[PDB]
């Protein structure tokens, strides 16, 4: 070994880290962690395979000190919810949705602080309805979360079937509102206006005028188009002509 230190200096100065980097690498800092995160998140995938998915969250400003132990704590708890829907149309998942809840200072009860859910889903009203508005338990929070999730699935479920109908050329081009409640489409040359609740058509309108499209023909077509959405594809294909 060369004189990293003089032999009259290495006599006292410890040389251990130069004999082995372990003594030095001990301070600087593994294989197991990278390989076990593997299976845990694979299970986390398997849990995102359920759709309704609580996820954690916090707010920065609500952190303070306990003044004696020099330790930090959070004033107000915060819950996060992630809302994934399986898109059978693509075998992938749609861009998720999130809703976030905070605790009141005095009441020790949740309140709706921030959320990603669009305004046509009245999340505040759902929250105020849950347990009379006194949302406390995580079970009440999951009731609220399930309600909003079913309300989102009731949108994706309509969008998926309508895009499927478009894909197979059962209908010509179409335009959709944001929540897929009012939808307009040309079938071959006839065009139709629909207004749908969750899973069901509630009103229909046929606009085009055709020689065989008498008022009685028009009326019975418009009436037959009502009902559950699952049968719409079948009955439209049957009424192709």
């Amino acid at each position: 070994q060369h004189q990293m230190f003089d032999p009259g200096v290495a006599d006292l100065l410890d040389t251990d880290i130069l004999t082995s980097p372990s003594k030095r690498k001990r301070k600087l800092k593994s294989t197991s962690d990278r390989s076990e995160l593997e299976d845990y998140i694979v299970l986390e995938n398997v849990y995102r395979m359920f759709g309704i998915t609580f996820f954690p969250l916090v707010d920065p400003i609500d952190l303070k000190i306990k003044d004696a132990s020099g330790e930090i704590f959070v004033d107000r708890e915060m819950l996060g919810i992630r809302l994934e829907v399986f898109s059978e149309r693509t075998s992938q998942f749609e861009k998720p949705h999130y809703v976030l809840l905070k605790k009141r200072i005095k009441s020790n009860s949740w309140f709706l602080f921030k959320h990603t859910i669009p305004s046509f889903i009245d999340v505040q009203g759902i929250f105020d309805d849950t347990n009379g508005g006194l949302v406390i338990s995580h079970d009440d929070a999951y009731l609220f979360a399930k309600r909003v999730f079913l309300q989102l699935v009731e949108v994706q479920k309509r969008r998926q079937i309508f895009k499927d109908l478009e894909a197979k050329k059962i209908i010509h081009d179409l335009d959709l509102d944001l929540e897929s409640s009012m939808v307009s489409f040309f079938v071959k040359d006839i065009k139709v206006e629909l207004f749908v609740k969750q899973n069901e058509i509630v009103s229909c309108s046929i606009l085009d005028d055709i020689h065989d499209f008498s008022q009685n023909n028009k009326s019975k077509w418009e009436i037959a188009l009502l009902g559950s959405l699952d049968d719409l594809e079948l009955k439209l294909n049957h009424s192709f002509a």
Binding site: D6, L13, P21, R24, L28
Partner: protein, 108 residues
Amino acid sequence: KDVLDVYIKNLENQIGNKRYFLKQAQGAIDEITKRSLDTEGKPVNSEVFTELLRKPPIGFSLTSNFLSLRAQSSSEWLSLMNDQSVDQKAMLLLQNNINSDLKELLRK
């Protein structure tokens, strides 16, 4: 990047080596000065100092900083220097004008 990556890693490891060297060194200083239980100091013998005067990437660091610090500090000196010359010369020509003006006042 790899050549600079490997070199930064080697120099960081050597920096850590030097940190441990300094820490254990100052620990030795503290313990052997504790052996110097008295506040007084032993006259460092010439013969002991003589035999210390007979026994003893690092250089690239040494070259790089001796040279770079030779770079801007020089330009700063001449620039601050030349900045002094230009305005003190301006004082001098104003100085000579007043002297030249006052020189004829003296004749007056």
